[PDB]
Amino acid sequence: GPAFEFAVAMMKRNSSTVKTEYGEFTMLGIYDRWAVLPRHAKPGPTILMNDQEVGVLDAKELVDKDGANLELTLLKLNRNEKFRDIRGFLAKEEVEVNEAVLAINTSKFPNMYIPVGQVTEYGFLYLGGTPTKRMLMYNFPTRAGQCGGVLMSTGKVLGIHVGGNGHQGFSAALLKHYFN
Amino acid sequence: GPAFEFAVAMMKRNSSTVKTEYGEFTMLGIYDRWAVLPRHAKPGPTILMNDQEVGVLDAKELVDKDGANLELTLLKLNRNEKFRDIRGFLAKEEVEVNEAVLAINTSKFPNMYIPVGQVTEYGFLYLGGTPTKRMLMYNFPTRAGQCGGVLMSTGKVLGIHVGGNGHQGFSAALLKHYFN
Ligand SMILES: *[C@@H](CC(=O)OCC)[C@H](C[C@@H]1CCNC1=O)NC(=O)[C@H](Cc1ccccc1)NC(=O)[C@H](CC(=O)OC(C)(C)C)NC(=O)OCc1ccccc1
Ligand SMILES: *[C@@H](CC(=O)OCC)[C@H](C[C@@H]1CCNC1=O)NC(=O)[C@H](Cc1ccccc1)NC(=O)[C@H](CC(=O)OC(C)(C)C)NC(=O)OCc1ccccc1
Numbered sequence: 001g002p003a004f005e006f007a008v009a010m011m012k013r014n015s016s017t018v019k020t021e022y023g024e025f026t027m028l029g030i031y032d033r034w035a036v037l038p039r040h041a042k043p044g045p046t047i048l049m050n051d052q053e054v055g056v057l058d059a060k061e062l063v064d065k066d067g068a069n070l071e072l073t074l075l076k077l078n079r080n081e082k083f084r085d086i087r088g089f090l091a092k093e094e095v096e097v098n099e100a101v102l103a104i105n106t107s108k109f110p111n112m113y114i115p116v117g118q119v120t121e122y123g124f125l126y127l128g129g130t131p132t133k134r135m136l137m138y139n140f141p142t143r144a145g146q147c148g149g150v151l152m153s154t155g156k157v158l159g160i161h162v163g164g165n166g167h168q169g170f171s172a173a174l175l176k177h178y179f180n
Numbered sequence: 181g182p183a184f185e186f187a188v189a190m191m192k193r194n195s196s197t198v199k200t201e202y203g204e205f206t207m208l209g210i211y212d213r214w215a216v217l218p219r220h221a222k223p224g225p226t227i228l229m230n231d232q233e234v235g236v237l238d239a240k241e242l243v244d245k246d247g248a249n250l251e252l253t254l255l256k257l258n259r260n261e262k263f264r265d266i267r268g269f270l271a272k273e274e275v276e277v278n279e280a281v282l283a284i285n286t287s288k289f290p291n292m293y294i295p296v297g298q299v300t301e302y303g304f305l306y307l308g309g310t311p312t313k314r315m316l317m318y319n320f321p322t323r324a325g326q327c328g329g330v331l332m333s334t335g336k337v338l339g340i341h342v343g344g345n346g347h348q349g350f351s352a353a354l355l356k357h358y359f360n
Contacts (some may be wrong), residue, residue, distance in 0.1 A: 004291035008188075101291070111184035111281070113293045140323065 002154045008103045010152065013084050017106045018148070019048040024106045025148035028160065029083030030074075030090075030179055033057075038147045038162045038172070039071045040128070047075075054079050062178060068133040071162045071172045074179075076083070077149060086157065090176040094134055095158045096123045102141055104149035112149075114141050116169060117156065118150065125161045125170060132169055134173040135162075141169040182334045187281045187293060191330065193264050195251060197286045198328070199228040204286045205328035208340065209263030210254075210270075211360055218327045218342045218352070219251045220308070229253075234259050248313040251342045251352045254359075263291060263296075267335065270356040273337045274301045274314055280320055282341055282349070284329035292329075294321050296349060299331065299338065307343045314353040315342075321349040 001007035001043050018027040020041050027049065037043055039061050050144035055078030062070040089137040100119045104112040136151065149161035151171040159171030198207040200221050209215040217223055219241050226233050235258030241249040245355065280299045284292040302317035316331065322344035329341035331351040339351030 001290060099290075109295050110181060110279075111293060112295050113291060115289050115292050143320065 003099065003101045003115075003152065004113060006101045006154045007150075007152050010086070010089070010150065010157065011103050011105055011111075013166075014086055015103070015105050015150065016050050018043070020044065023082045023147075024108060024145060026103070026105050026150065027148055028150050028157070031085035031087050032082055033077045033079060034179065035075050035077060035083065036160055036174065037075060038160060039069065039073050040162070041073060041148065043073060043075050049077070064133055069130050070179070071127065071130075071132050072160060072174070087176060087179050089155065089157050090160050090174055090179070091156055092152055092172045092176045094136060095153075095156065096136075097153050097158070100138065100153050102138075102146075102149045102151050102160060104146045104161070106133050107146060108145050112146075115116055116141055116151070119171075122170065125163075127170065132172075135172040136170050136173055138171075140167050142167060183279065183281045183295075183332065184293060186334045187283045187330075187332050188257065190266070190269070190330065190331070190337065191291075194266055195283070195285050195330065198223070198256045200224065203327075204325060206283070206285050206287060206330065207328055208330050208337070211267050212262055213257045213259060215223055215255050215257060215263065216340055216354065217253045217255060219249065219253050220342070221253060221328065223253060229257070239307050240297060244313055249310050250289060250314055251307065251310075251312050252340060252354070252358070254273050266332035267359050268333065269337050269353055271336055271338050271356050272356045274316060274353045275336065276300050276316075277333050277338070280318065280325075280333050280338060282329045282331050282332055284341070286325060288325050291325075296321055296331070299351075302350065305343075307350065310318075312352075314355075316351040316353055318349050318351075320347050322347060337345075
């Protein structure tokens with residue numbers, strides 16, 4: 001009920017559709033000129049953001065202390081406009097919930113809102129052959145074109161959707177401390 | 181973009197969650213006290229509508245001239261409140277579109293909005309062993325609990341989701357002339 005409304009306001013104000021040479025993704029802007037994509041989107045020095053080319057000034061593929069893949073890329077956009085700062089809405093650690101929304105917004109799947117149910121701390125996953133950490137698992141989404149989707153509960157952004165197999169979907173935890 | 185917004189306003193104002201002895205469904209109220217469910221929901225003399233028992237005064241399983249199943253049940257509710265009249269938003273015939281939204285709202289899948297893509301006039305289908313007519317086909321939804329979902333484009337209600345197999349989903353066309 002409310003999760004949906006929180007999710008619409010977030011996507012309206014902070015999401016965009018991105019095309020890289022590797023596909024189409026939902027992208028979430030975080031603050032200033034910093035946004036987040038799944039690592040596998042591999043953004044280059046320019047991306048198409050809502051149909052417009054936008055320069056990327058820097059791109060950081062996140063890894064943990066020991067260098068384990070976190071499957072997220074932080075990108076700094078070469079644009080004058082700043083994002084509305086949503087760092088306050090970010091989870092401080094991996095979050096488990098009984099109900100969450102996955103929000104996806106691309107030209108192929110516009111304005112898609114999926115109630116994904118129980119979200120659990122899956123932890124380590126061999127995702128597309130790559131050892132990955134801080135995975136959140138949920139049942140029931142799981143097609144190409146949905147990566148970058150934003151996983152949310154009321155008033156919190158939990159993760160960014162990165163992978164899946166069968167009826168299972170996986171988000172990279174989107175943690176407050178990643179930003180700065 | 182707009183299809184989503186039209187879809188939210190419709191669901192907000194005219195949809196409800198229904199439980200019959202046969203499951204949980206999205207239900208759309210049409211006008212007066214008349215609402216629509218998939219035929220297979222088989223509503224009895226009482227249904228649970230948004231958590232409250234509500235009497236059903238009459239239930240008509242629709243069939244065409246020759247008695248072919250249309251897979252829709254019209255129900256008249258024993259309640260004082262009238263539905264907002266949306267007969268004007270109903271398609272007059274089977275509609276094919278390149279993009280449509282499927283909106284599903286139950287306790288298990290709350291506030292679910294799915295862009296389903298190309299919607300074509302499939303026509304006759306052997307659905308769950310029953311010969312059925314006036315089917316609209318689209319790719320990509322297709323789980324238990326989603327029947328009754330409302331298929332829409334901007335400013336039009338096209339159908340009610342009734343069945344599926346694999347990545348294919350099927351709506352019964354929701355035609356203006358069924359109401360009266
Ligand atoms: C989003 C990005 C995308 O579409 O890229 C291709 C254009 C996509 C979403 C998943 C596809 C299936 N379900 C989804 O939700 N992500 C990926 O494809 C992701 C890319 C990736 C991520 C990390 C490192 C490398 C690559 N890969 C996966 O999700 C893979 C999918 C896969 O290879 O399997 C099939 C394509 C389904 C055959 N999933 C995976 O490796 O899971 C292993 C596994 C097995 C059993 C249980 C859990 C997980
Ligand atoms: C919604 C109602 C429901 O959940 O009832 C059970 C509690 C549900 C939605 C579909 C399930 C799979 N995908 C869906 O979108 N509807 C049905 O289950 C529907 C009930 C029905 C409708 C009409 C007459 C009798 C019964 N049945 C179907 O969709 C059947 C599903 C089925 O039996 O197959 C599996 C369960 C998937 C194994 N679909 C069907 O008969 O399709 C035949 C077909 C084959 C190849 C191409 C197209 C269609």
